[PDB]
């Protein structure tokens, strides 16, 4: 691939969707793959979305019965959406960048891992999942390997506040203590670089850490400048 | 691929494992991919096999909770086991044939389908499975497309008797009425060719139907002769 693939990572409600749609518009060479599960959320037919909608709501109702199915599908959907763009976009662009909202790595090492640590996945489901994940990506990930990661870093308070603001019903019960596990997970993974994964190149992937505690919706030029400077080093 | 891939299909206990190991031995050009789930069954600690054992026994205990997970993993395991042999075997062989015990088609159109009709998979799981199956094989099946099928045909009585003889504990409760659903499924798929699938080339795939009602363990030369004659037409 001659297209640069950057994932944007970070806590629930940190600002990823907002930042990713900001980026989209700043360049014709810049293109986005929104997170498939994002699509599913809202209240136009599509089979993935019918499935996604259903499993997402079953997830809220009973995670210990639907984590493995949700996370398997959430992942496949990601891989195919990212392939679709990798292969169908930015062909005439001279500096092509593809921004992935989140990645197959946060699928496994943040979200699936959490679910297993909450015992919503038992040892068999967790082992089956990582194996399938291992294999799925061993074959298909090859054109998906990330050139860089941007980390939108927000305190859990910030995140909680933003879940409020987003006002998406199903989300309003998410406690601070949950956002803090994820935050510790992200910190470990992208800041201290302690989280050892099964994808070796990850240990050498450049990370950009961006503080998004302060609202950036109308004031984002310095975040974009840091992105651009970052991109020119990859 | 210059290797010929033939799947051996048929009801539980019809004789596939037996016939497949018979074939293995008759030629250096002839090579087998045993069904992964077959592996899992016994005991007397590879990660697939720990997973496979666990989910297989959870399947016996509660199919309506584990059918999706079992059938997802049984299938991935098959795809990767067949890829492994497709790419690592029969390189120096002049007439190379790979015999697959069962296939990704019986995974879906016999076993998964059955489970869905038993209501062990709900509409979402069934829809997510076929889609994942569609997609998994749309990408990876390309070197797996079968050149031919052999159908080992046995009455359900025969099969039941053989489940008896195999003496595998977990299997001893399988009723005749279950083996007859599968048999009707196999008949519909490989005899009347009415079972319409999502893989178009399947409608033109040559099938060899072999009566294995009579024991063939010590008397198989005419079955092998039919196989060889079959193979020369592919
Ligand atoms: O600079 C920002 C970025 C985020 N948001 C708000 O935070 C909420 C959720 O943001 P987003 O969908 O981007 O979060 P994520 O996609 O990371 O989960 C929405 O109300 C956004 O408008 C905001 O007010 N200012
Ligand atoms: O011609 C035959 C075919 C089957 N068997 C026995 O019947 C049992 C079930 O057959 P198999 O395991 O091969 O069935 P499959 O599931 O592989 O179709 C095994 O113990 C076989 O040795 C036999 O004695 N003679």
Can you tell me the distance from the alpha carbon of B193 to that of B188, in angstroms, rounded to the nearest whole number? 6
Flag if B128 and A58 touch (Cβ within 8 Å). Answer: no
Go through chain B and list every residue after which a break occurs, taking a C to next N gap over 2.5 angstroms, comma-separated: 44
E strands, chain B, are 4-9, 30-33, 97-101, 148-153, 207-211
Residues in CB range of A218: below 8 A, 6 or more apart = none
- Dig out the tokens for A88 from the structure: 């169908």
- The answer to whether the CB of A179 falls within 8 A of the CB of A12 is yes
Strand partners, A9: A151
The dihedral sign for the CA sequence B130, B131, B134, B139: negative
- The answer to whether the CB of B11 falls within 8 A of the CB of B155 is no
The dihedral sign for the CA sequence A47, A51, A57, A59: negative
Q: Give B170's Cβ-side CA count (13 Å radius).
A: 11
DSSP, res B31? E
- Dig out the tokens for B82 from the structure: 């067949």
Element housing B222 (H / E) = helix B221-231
What is the CB neighbour count within 10 angstroms for residue A206? 14
Can you tell me the distance from the alpha carbon of A50 to that of A56, in angstroms, rounded to the nearest whole number? 10
Element housing A149 (H / E) = strand A148-153
Terminal Cα distance for chain A, rounded: 14
Which one is catalytic: A9, A31, A61, A101?
Answer: A101
Does A16 contact ligand 1 (Cβ within 6 A)?
Answer: yes
Number of independent structural domains in chain B: 1
What is the CB neighbour count within 10 angstroms for residue B101? 24
CA-wise closest residue to B133 among B197, B220, B221, B229? B197
Residues in CB range of A30: below 8 A, 6 or more apart = A23, A24, A97, A99
Can you tell me the distance from the alpha carbon of A37 to that of A58, in angstroms, rounded to the nearest whole number? 14
The number of residues in chain A equals: 234
CA-wise closest residue to B14 among B211, B185, B191, B154? B154
DSSP, res A189? I
- Dig out the tokens for B122 from the structure: 């709900």
- Residue in B77, B124, B125 to test binding to A, most A beta-carbons within 10 Å: B124
Catalytic residues of B: 101
Instruction: Beginning with the edge strand found earlier in the chain, give each strand of the sheet holding A97-101 in spatial order.
Output: A30-33, A97-101, A4-9, A148-153, A207-211
Indicate the resolution in Å: 2.5
Domain boundaries, position B25: 1-234
Q: How far is the CA of A13 from the centre of ligand 1 (A)?
A: 6
- The answer to whether the CB of A107 falls within 8 A of the CB of A115 is no
B62-89 b/e (C-beta count within 10 Å ≥ 16 → b)? ebeebbbbbbbbbbbbbbbbbbebbeee
- Dig out the tokens for A172 from the structure: 């309003």
Mutate to test the pocket of ligand 1, among A9, A11, A18 (most ligand atoms within 8 A of CB): A18
Can you tell me the distance from the alpha carbon of A110 to that of A105, in angstroms, rounded to the nearest whole number? 8
The experimental method behind these coordinates is: X-ray
Residue B43, classified by CB atoms within 10 Å of its CB into exposed (0-12), middle (13-18) or buried (19+), is exposed
CATH value at residue B90 = 3.40.50.300
Size of interface A-B (CB pairs under 8 A): 54
Can you tell me the distance from the alpha carbon of A42 to that of B148, in angstroms, rounded to the nearest whole number? 46
Element housing B69 (H / E) = helix B63-88
Can you tell me the distance from the alpha carbon of B133 to that of B105, in angstroms, rounded to the nearest whole number? 9
Closest-CA residue, ligand 1 atom 7, reads A162
Measured between beta carbons, the chain A residues lying within 8 angstroms of B65 are 65
């Amino acid at each position: 691939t001659r297209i640069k693939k950057i994932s944007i990572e970070g806590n629930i409600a940190a600002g990823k969707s907002t930042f990713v749609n900001i980026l989209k518009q700043l360049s014709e060479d810049w293109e986005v793959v929104p997170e498939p599960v994002a699509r599913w959320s809202n209240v136009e037919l599509t089979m993935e979305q019918k499935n996604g909608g259903n499993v997402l709501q079953m997830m809220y109702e009973k995670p210990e019965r639907w984590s493995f199915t949700f996370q398997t599908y959430a992942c496949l959907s990601r891989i195919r959406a990212q392939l679709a763009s990798l292969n169908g976009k930015l062909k005439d662009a001279e500096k092509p960048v593809l921004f992935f909202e989140r990645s197959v790595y946060s699928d496994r090492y943040i979200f699936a891992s959490n679910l297993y640590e909450s015992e919503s996945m038992n040892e068999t489901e967790w082992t089956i999942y990582q194996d399938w994940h291992d294999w799925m990506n061993n074959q298909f990930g090859q054109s998906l390997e990330l050139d860089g990661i941007i980390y939108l870093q927000a305190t859990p308070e910030t995140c909680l506040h933003r879940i409020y603001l987003r006002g998406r019903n199903e989300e309003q019960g998410i406690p601070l203590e949950y956002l803090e596990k994820l935050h510790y997970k992200h910190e470990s993974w992208l800041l201290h670089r302690t989280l050892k994964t099964n994808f070796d190149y990850l240990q050498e992937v450049p990370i950009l850490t961006l503080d998004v505690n302060e609202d950036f919706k109308d004031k984002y030029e310095s975040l974009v400048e840091k992105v651009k400077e970052f991109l020119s080093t990859l």
